[PDB]
């Protein structure tokens, strides 16, 4: 018995933090690769 999909429809009826997590991820990949 899984109610999570039935709960996932109950509530429904680019983001500036995610850009900074990608600049921090692309910076660590830079300094160690040849």
């Amino acid at each position: 018995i899984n109610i999570d999909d039935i709960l996932a429809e109950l509530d429904k009826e680019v983001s500036p933090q995610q850009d900074f997590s990608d600049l921090m991820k692309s910076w660590k990949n830079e300094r160690c690769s040849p």
Binding site: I1, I3, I6, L7, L10, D11, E13
Partner: protein
């Protein structure tokens, strides 16, 4: 039996020589012995709108009540009070209370309009916020007193009457009483902590108010009560919501221990801020540690039936019933606060909405177990409480998966009667 002066969450001297006098959700007041005199500190939990100070005592104060507007001090033998407002513009004043032979002062109160001094023979003297007296009234002896924005809560007691609260509201001119001397469900007491029971015989640690306007009281049973529906004259119930003998037993790994205790400060929406004192002596010491938190749980667990399932892990078949009660209780304190007075902050509607979403969801962990053991009547009555209508058709798809086909008809019989209700 003796009367002792009471102040919210005070602490005695012990072998040391510095104690707190009050401790609530604004600041804490400490005192320090100079053999001749005392040095009183008034330190605050908030920083922005307030400053701290300290001054020198020459009388021996042992009663206080610290809140937002002022700081009402007191003296337990000579009958001498002093009122020190936090503002620099308004000046202080001092008045000396009439006392008869063999009389004390038990507790004081510092409402934004009135100032209440209740003594240990029953007198109820009420000033105004500058020092003009208004009344003298005779009631039962008073052993505790507190207040919020306009309301006043108190605990009477005699040697033959018995415990009784009283909950009034001195407004601008309205003096609407709500409960006048109704009885109160609490258990008084009957070692390292023998120094405590000489200090406070009544056993009430610290009574206070909520942040929403609901009285609480933390007894010596270590069980925080709460009052509901107090705007109604005939519906008041005392809902217990926390056992400090149980939250410690879970966190100690299923074990009796005599090291962690509970000292409360205030209440929030659903959390209790606590000074987890660790040691034999159950009062906190100096300096005051950081106030931790603790959640509220309705007392439905068993001390024995968890141990046969082996920190402590709970099966879901027992954890489901507790969340059923807890969102049921919290709704009745929230659905009336909006309807009668209203909301203060503005975000009160969305937490109300998400609390209903925990109500129907926690029922469906139980509703599925009722179909698992081939029971149609037990699982029928549970579908009359879901005020959320989008979970009604959600239950029908759980009815077919357990293959109780007559039960599938009955839920659709419920939906139609609540469907015709809306059209009228």
């Amino acid at each position: 039996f003796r009367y002792m002066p009471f102040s919210p969450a005070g602490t005695p001297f012990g072998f040391t020589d510095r104690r707190y006098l009050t401790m609530n959700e604004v600041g804490y007041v400490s005192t320090v012995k100079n053999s001749e005199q005392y040095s009183i500190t008034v330190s605050f939990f908030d920083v922005g709108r307030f400053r701290e100070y300290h001054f020198e005592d020459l009388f021996g104060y042992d009663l206080c009540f610290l809140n937002e507007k002022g700081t009402l001090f007191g003296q337990s033998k000579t009958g001498q009070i002093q009122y020190r407002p936090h503002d620099s513009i308004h000046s202080n004043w001092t008045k000396i209370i009439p006392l008869q032979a063999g009389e004390r002062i038990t507790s004081v109160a510092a409402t934004p309009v009135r100032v209440i001094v209740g003594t240990s023979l029953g007198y109820f003297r009420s000033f105004n916020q500058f020092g003009v007296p208004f009344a003298v009234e005779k009631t039962s002896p008073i052993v505790a007193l507190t207040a919020q924005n306009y309301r006043v809560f108190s605990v009477h007691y005699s040697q033959f009457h018995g415990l009784s609260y009283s909950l009034s509201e001195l407004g601008t001119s309205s003096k609407r009483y709500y409960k006048r001397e109704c009885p109160l469900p609490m258990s008084l007491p009957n070692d390292a902590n023998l120094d405590y029971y000489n200090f406070n015989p009544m056993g009430i640690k610290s009574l206070f108010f909520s942040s929403y306007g609901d009285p609480c009281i933390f007894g010596s049973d270590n069980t925080l009560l709460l009052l509901s529906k107090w705007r109604s004259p005939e519906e008041s119930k005392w809902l217990p919501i926390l056992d400090s003998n149980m939250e410690i037993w879970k966190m100690s790994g299923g074990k009796e221990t005599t090291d962690i205790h509970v000292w409360p400060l205030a209440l929030a929406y659903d959390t209790l801020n606590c000074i987890l004192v660790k040691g034999k002596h159950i009062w906190p010491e100096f300096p005051l540690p950081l106030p931790s938190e603790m959640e509220i749980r309705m007392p439905v667990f068993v001390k024995s039936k968890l141990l046969e399932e082996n920190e402590i892990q709970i099966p879901v078949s027992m954890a489901a019933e507790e969340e059923y009660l807890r969102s049921k209780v919290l709704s009745e304190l929230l659905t009336d606060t909006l309807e009668n007075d209203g909301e203060m902050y503005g975000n009160e509607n969305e937490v109300l909405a998400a609390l209903n979403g925990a109500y129907d969801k926690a029922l469906l962990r139980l509703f599925a177990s009722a179909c698992s053991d081939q029971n149609v009547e037990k699982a029928l009555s549970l579908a009359h409480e879901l005020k959320q209508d989008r979970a009604l058709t959600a239950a029908v798809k759980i009815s077919e998966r357990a293959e109780l086909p007559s039960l599938v008809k009955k839920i659709n019989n419920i939906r139609e009667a609540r469907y015709e209700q809306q059209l009228k």
